[PDB]
Design a protein around this ligand. Structure first.
Ligand SMILES: [Cl-]
Ligand SMILES: [Cl-]
Ligand SMILES: [Cl-]
Ligand SMILES: [Cl-]
Ligand SMILES: [Mg+2]
Ligand SMILES: [Mg+2]
Ligand SMILES: [Mg+2]
Ligand SMILES: [Mg+2]
Ligand SMILES: [Mg+2]
Ligand SMILES: [Mg+2]
Ligand SMILES: [Mg+2]
Ligand code: NA
Ligand code: NA
Ligand code: NA
Ligand code: NA
Ligand code: NA
Ligand code: NA
Ligand code: NA
Ligand code: NA
Ligand code: NA
Ligand code: NA
Lengths: 135, 135
């Protein structure tokens, strides 16, 4: 049990150091948005990928999340944008061991490369929508 | 101050959710490795990039970190590997606003794509070396 998954340790380190750095700069309303994404993150977006990845410890099937993200961001809606983000976070929770890190990074890249310019406005719109409906 | 940097919020969310997921699975010795990377992370690897990025709020000059990482991992050493990781973390702390997220993701990709297979062994070697020298 002295074996070290270098890829895993390095990814965890960099992810936390970047997460904490960004969080320190966020505005109060940006912080409210982050919490809302956490709350929405507990609603499983793809139970099929939850079960399939519950199995294992092909690469063709590791592409399904990226294809779904791209499909969600293709004439899109704020809801589909948040849904794409939440799907990525949820695959992150399953794709923790070293050899899966490659698939996870592609997934996030597909996400952030295919966002709309209206993302800043749409996320503000989504936040106020969920707040007004649930508040 | 109601404007929302969607890219920033989404990146922070995903980075934290992935960091916490990986951390929960890490072995005790893998956890010791993560702390060691934090300690080493307080030793600025490139003061020049620290000063240059202290300025601003070109893309040619945002490529310098990636080129340094690739140079460090080109017949490499454990020390250069850790140094590459620490340089990435330190650029993460400067590259927090939305339009810089693109550069940061490339940087990390260059890092993890150019690792050696001996990374798992080398990180174990580095950990025991720093422990034996400082313990
Ligand atoms: Cl989940
Ligand atoms: Cl409310
Ligand atoms: Cl730093
Ligand atoms: Cl010690
Ligand atoms: Mg601020
Ligand atoms: Mg899912
Ligand atoms: Mg596919
Ligand atoms: Mg374990
Ligand atoms: Mg630096
Ligand atoms: Mg260059
Ligand atoms: Mg990438
Ligand atoms: Na507020
Ligand atoms: Na599905
Ligand atoms: Na690996
Ligand atoms: Na889009
Ligand atoms: Na709603
Ligand atoms: Na231990
Ligand atoms: Na330098
Ligand atoms: Na942006
Ligand atoms: Na290498
Ligand atoms: Na040493």
């Amino acid at each position: 049990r002295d074996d070290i998954d270098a890829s895993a340790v390095m990814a965890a380190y960099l992810a936390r150091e970047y997460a904490e750095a960004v969080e320190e700069q966020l505005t109060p309303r940006e912080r409210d948005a982050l919490e809302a994404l956490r709350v929405s993150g507990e609603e499983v977006r793809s139970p099929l990928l939850q079960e399939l990845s519950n199995a294992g410890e092909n690469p063709e099937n590791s592409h399904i999340p990226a294809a779904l993200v791209s499909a969600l961001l293709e004439p899109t809606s704020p809801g589909r944008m948040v849904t794409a983000v939440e799907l990525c976070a949820q695959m992150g929770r399953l794709w923790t061991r070293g050899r899966q890190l490659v698939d996870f990074m592609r997934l996030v890249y597909v996400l952030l490369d295919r966002l709309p310019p209206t993302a800043d406005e749409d996320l503000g719109a989504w936040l106020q929508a969920v707040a007004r409906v649930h508040g």
